[PDB]
Amino acid sequence: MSTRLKIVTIHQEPFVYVKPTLSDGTCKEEFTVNGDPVKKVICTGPNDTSPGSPRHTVPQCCYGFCIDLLIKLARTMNFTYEVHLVADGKFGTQERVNKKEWNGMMGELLSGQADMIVAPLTINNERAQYIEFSKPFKYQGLTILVKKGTRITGINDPRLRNPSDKFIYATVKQSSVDIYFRRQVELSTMYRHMEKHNYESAAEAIQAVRDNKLHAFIWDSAVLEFEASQKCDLVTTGELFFRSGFGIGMRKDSPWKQNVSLSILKSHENGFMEDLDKTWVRYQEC
Amino acid sequence: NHLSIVTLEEAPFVIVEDIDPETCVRNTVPCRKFVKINNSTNEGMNVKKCCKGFCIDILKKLSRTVKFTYDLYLVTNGKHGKKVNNVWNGMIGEVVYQRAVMAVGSLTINEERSEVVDFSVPFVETGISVMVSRGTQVTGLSDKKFQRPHDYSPPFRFGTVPNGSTERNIRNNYPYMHQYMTKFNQKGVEDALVSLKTGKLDAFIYDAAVLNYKAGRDEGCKLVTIGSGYIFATTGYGIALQKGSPWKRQIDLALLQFVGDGEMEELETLWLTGIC
Numbered sequence: 063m064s065t066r067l068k069i070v071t072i073h074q075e076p077f078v079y080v081k082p083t084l085s086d087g088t089c090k091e092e093f094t095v096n097g098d099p100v101k102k103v104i105c106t107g108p109n110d111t112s113p114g115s116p117r118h119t120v121p122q123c124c125y126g127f128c129i130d131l132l133i134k135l136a137r138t139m140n141f142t143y144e145v146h147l148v149a150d151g152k153f154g155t156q157e158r159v160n161k162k163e164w165n166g167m168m169g170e171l172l173s174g175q176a177d178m179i180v181a182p183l184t185i186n187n188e189r190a191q192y193i194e195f196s197k198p199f200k201y202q203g204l205t206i207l208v209k210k211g212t213r214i215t216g217i218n219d220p221r222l223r224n225p226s227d228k229f230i231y232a233t234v235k236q237s238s239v240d241i242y243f244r245r246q247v248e249l250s251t252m253y254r255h256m257e258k259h260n261y262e263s264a265a266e267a268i269q270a271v272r273d274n275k276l277h278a279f280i281w282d283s284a285v286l287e288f289e290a291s292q293k294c295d296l297v298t299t300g301e302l303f304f305r306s307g308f309g310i311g312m313r314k315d316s317p318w319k320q321n322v323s324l325s326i327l328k329s330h331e332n333g334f335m336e337d338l339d340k341t342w343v344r345y346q347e348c
Numbered sequence: 349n350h351l352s353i354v355t356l357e358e359a360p361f362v363i364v365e366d367i368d369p370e371t372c373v374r375n376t377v378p379c380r381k382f383v384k385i386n387n388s389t390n391e392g393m394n395v396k397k398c399c400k401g402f403c404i405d406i407l408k409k410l411s412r413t414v415k416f417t418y419d420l421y422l423v424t425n426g427k428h429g430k431k432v433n434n435v436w437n438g439m440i441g442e443v444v445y446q447r448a449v450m451a452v453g454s455l456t457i458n459e460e461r462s463e464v465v466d467f468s469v470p471f472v473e474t475g476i477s478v479m480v481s482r483g484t485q486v487t488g489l490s491d492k493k494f495q496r497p498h499d500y501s502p503p504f505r506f507g508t509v510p511n512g513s514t515e516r517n518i519r520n521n522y523p524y525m526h527q528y529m530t531k532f533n534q535k536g537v538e539d540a541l542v543s544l545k546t547g548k549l550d551a552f553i554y555d556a557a558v559l560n561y562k563a564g565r566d567e568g569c570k571l572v573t574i575g576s577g578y579i580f581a582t583t584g585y586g587i588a589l590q591k592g593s594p595w596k597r598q599i600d601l602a603l604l605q606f607v608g609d610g611e612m613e614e615l616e617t618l619w620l621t622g623i624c
């Protein structure tokens with residue numbers, strides 16, 4: 063028995079912060095900038111971060127923009143949910159197996175493992191052929207994150223348009239940014255360099271730009287522009303090459319698709335989405 | 349395959365032109381407007397006008413990609429869309445009461461409209477923006493000059509063009525501001541830009557994408573959008589389609605292709621980019 067929605071998510075600060083449960087299996091009482099309590103959910107994701115390894119599922123503490131938004135969509139539409147993290151830690155791309163299959167959250171949604179995707183999931187043509195996206199809950203773009211000192215014009219710096227070994231840049235494997243370079247001819251000389259260095263996770267690449275084991279990171283501006291504000295040693299370069307929005311993922315059969323978009327609009331209109339942004343996304347300076 | 353499609357003029361989204369002294373030339377598509385013989389009869393005639401603009405270039409692209417032909421007309425019953433005694437008018441109205449298969453123009457997606465019609469994925473970011481003469485001090489809609497206008501002496505003068513998404517958003521969220529604004533209702537955008545430039549109005553609250561376009565193209569760059577062109581109650585321009593429409597998928601995937609291809613950034617360079 064159930065009508066309890068399987069919610070797949072990913073770890074992506076400031077959208078979804080994932081932390082351990084306490085010794086009783088409960089979540090730490092944290093309070094916002096305002097002083098209001100941080101809303102927290104339990105998310106049943108794995109522990110072994112290694113690829114091709116046994117996934118041992120363990121309850122964890124999930125909170126962030128996308129959790130507040132999920133709690134909102136839940137209250138509003140009146141539904142119950144269970145949150146779990148994407149078993150392979152990926153967003154979703156379609157790869158050749160003749161037959162093709164989706165990895166990450168996209169794979170999870172389409173396979174039945176999840177009934178909805180509440181994460182910073184970029185809306186694109188590829189995914190939209192297979193899944194239904196909500197009206198966007200965020201509009202951002204792509205930018206380049208570098209260590210303070212690294213000088214780059216933007217996406218058209220000679221160190222990026224003509225690659226080498228002195229300058230190593232990459233993105234997250236099996237994401238929309240991967241698909242973006244993988245489908246564009248003008249960026250063919252970029253993707254062939256980037257596929258040699260792509261990271262399993264955003265956290266890992268942002269770490270590698272801190273370690274100087276990476277020079278530039280092409281990723282989502284809502285995340286990158288945030289990491290720079292949190293970590294003053296890192297900086298974003300150039301304006302925004304390509305603009306994209308985030309949407310709630312569902313299957314094409316899902317009878318919630320209408321009511322999800324009606325809530326996202328209700329929320330934009332009544333300043334609750336600007337409220338979420340003011341709470342999570344836009345804070346700190348360097 | 350041959351679809352009835354409604355539009356509404358609003359530069360630079362939709363631009364109406366008169367037919368050549370024989371037919372519609374260049375990037376222009378033909379567009380019929382039903383003009384009344386008199387104001388005490390329903391008897392009128394379909395004038396053949398010539399349509400162009402950002403949305404017309406999206407519609408031109410969509411017919412090619414999605415593989416449809418169309419009969420383009422200009423909405424005469426109202427404007428964008430307004431619910432009057434639970435009966436819709438304008439572009440929205442045309443789609444609801446199955447007079448149009450779809451509506452293409454500067455039509456704002458909002459929850460209210462999404463209950464009656466299906467919207468395509470957004471193609472232009474919009475919402476509410478506040479235009480002033482370079483020098484007016486406003487934080488945003490949150491300003492006590494707006495929220496509480498009689499707290500200030502003399503009161504702040506601000507208006508909108510009623511019966512659109514802006515007026516619905518202000519009515520919905522700020523009841524005191526709304527009731528105050530009504531006395532400063534503007535016929536259209538040109539009146540308000542004049543009322544602004546001629547000091548007869550201190551601020552004009554309107555659609556973000558049109559206000560942003562008006563700032564960038566302003567003669568002497570006197571009129572400006574508050575913040576750096578800051579949008580409140582953020583939304584977008586979508587193609588209105590009938591609820592449960594079969595064209596939604598085909599149109600959404602094409603629009604998503606145009607964003608990815610650079611075809612959309614191209615359209616923004618040709619039509620929306622400004623000087624200021």
Ligand SMILES: CCN(Cc1cc(=O)n2c(C(=O)NC)c(C)sc2n1)c1ccc(F)cc1
Nearest residue numbers: 197198200201307457470471472473583584
């Ligand atoms: C921030 C929430 N928004 C604005 C928004 C989202 C979006 O994805 N796009 C696209 C785009 O990338 N489309 C493929 C454009 C082009 S302009 C645009 N504006 C929003 C939210 C709800 C809504 F109904 C409309 C827009």
Ligand SMILES: N[C@@H](CCC(=O)O)C(=O)O
Nearest residue numbers: 428455456512513514555
């Ligand atoms: N584009 C708006 C009209 C303009 C406005 O209200 O600012 C609509 O579709 O209602």
